[PDB]
Amino acid sequence: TCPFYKKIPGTGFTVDAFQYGVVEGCTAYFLTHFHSDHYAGLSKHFTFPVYCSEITGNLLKNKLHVQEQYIHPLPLDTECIVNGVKVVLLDANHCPGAVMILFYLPNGTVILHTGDFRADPSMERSLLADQKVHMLYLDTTYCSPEYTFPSQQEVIRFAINTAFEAVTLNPHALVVCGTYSIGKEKVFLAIADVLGSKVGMSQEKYKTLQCLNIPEINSLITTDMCSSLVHLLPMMQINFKGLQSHLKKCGGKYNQILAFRPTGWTHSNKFTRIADVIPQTKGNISIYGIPYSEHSSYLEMKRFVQWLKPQKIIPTVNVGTWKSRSTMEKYFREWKLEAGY
Ligand code: NI
C-alpha cells in the first residue's frame, strides 16, 4: 500500500508510486526520474497515464517498453494542465531527465515535490521566485551537518588532472569508470575529452545513453572497446579481482588500470580534502573513490529551504526510523527559527 508521502492531496495524483498495484483514486502517475527505487513496478503492461520529462519518457519506451500511448512527456519551465490541475516541471539538478514538480491545487494551495535534487542558487531564479509554496515534499538524503562534499566542478577538475597525468606518464594505461544507473555522466565524458578518446561500453549502456539528448553524443561514446582508452564497467566490477580480469581481456594492449568509483558521501569526507584524495593500489591497478554527488549537501539543502520558506515540510528520504525522523524535524525547526519564517 502506497505511503502518504507519495500522494498529492486534493488531486488524483501520485509521485514515484508504481510498486503498489492500482492505487485507489489515482488518475495520473507522475515519475520524477529514471532511477530504479522510483520507477519500481513499471513495464510494457502498464496501462495508466504516466507524466514525466521527455528524457524520462525516451527511457520508459526504449528500456522498459512502456507503450507510447500511455507516455505523456511535458516540456520544462512551462505551465501545463493535467486532469484539470496546473503543473510545472523544473530541472532537479540530479541525473538526466530528473524534475521537480509544482502543483497549483484547485483550492489555492501550492505544493513543490523536489523528487531527488541537488539544490543550487540557480533555482532561486526559476519559476519558483514568482509565488508562495505551502507544502515541500523534500529529498532529505543528506539532511545532517556531517554530510559535506565538494562542488561537482572541483571533483571533475581532480578526475581530469589525475587521468591526464597518469596516461601521459604511461600511454599504455587504461582508464575505467564504474556505473550502475544513469547520472554522473560528466565523470567519464570529461576524462575521455581530455584524453582524445571515445568512451567504450556495452551495448545495453550505449542504448541507455542514446535516450539522454546529450549534444554531440555520437562523437563521444562507442561500443567498439578496442578503439577506446576510457571503458565503462558495472560498479560491482570496480575491485582488484574484477579489474585484473578485465585487463586480461584487452589482449596486451594495456599494462596498467586507473579506475574511478563515483560514490556519494563516504566518511573519508569528514577528514580529507579533495586535493588530498589517494587511491587504493595493488600492483598495476589503482582505484579512486571520488565524492561526486547528485544530491544536496546539508548546507545546500538548508539554503534552499531558508530561501523558499515553506509552511510545512514532508521528508521523502530517511523516513523509516524514529531517530532519523526526529533528527530531521529538529533541523527543520532550527532553520525556521534562524531565518524567521
Ligand atoms: Ni535518484
UniProtKB/Swiss-Prot annotation:
Summarize the protein's role: May be required for DNA interstrand cross-link repair. Also required for checkpoint mediated cell cycle arrest in early prophase in response to mitotic spindle poisons. Possesses beta-lactamase activity, catalyzing the hydrolysis of penicillin G and nitrocefin. Exhibits no activity towards other beta-lactam antibiotic classes including cephalosporins (cefotaxime) and carbapenems (imipenem).
Cite a GO CC annotation. Answer: fibrillar center
What induces its synthesis? During mitosis. The mRNA encoding this protein contains an internal ribosome entry site (IRES) in its 5'-UTR. This 5'-UTR generally suppresses translation while specifically promoting expression during mitosis, when cap-dependent translation may be impaired.
Keyword list (alphabetical) reads: Cell cycle, Cell division, DNA damage, DNA repair, Hydrolase, Isopeptide bond, Metal-binding, Mitosis, Nucleus, Phosphoprotein, Ubl conjugation, Zinc, Zinc-finger
* Tissue expression per record: Expressed in brain, heart, kidney, liver, pancreas, placenta and skeletal muscle.
Q: What is this protein called?
A: DNA cross-link repair 1A protein
Coiled coil start-end: none
The biological process GO terms on file are: cell division; double-strand break repair via nonhomologous end joining; interstrand cross-link repair
Q: Name the cystine pairs.
A: none
- Quaternary structure note: Binds constitutively to TP53BP1. Binds CDC27, which is itself a component of the anaphase promoting complex (APC). Binds PIAS1.
Q: GO MF terms on file?
A: 5'-3' DNA exonuclease activity; beta-lactamase activity; damaged DNA binding; zinc ion binding
**Protein species of origin:** Homo sapiens
Member of which family? Answer: Belongs to the DNA repair metallo-beta-lactamase (DRMBL) family.
Where this protein primarily resides, as one coarse class? nucleus
Gene transcribed to yield this protein: DCLRE1A
UniProt keyword Ion transport, yes or no: no
Q: Where in the cell is it found?
A: Nucleus
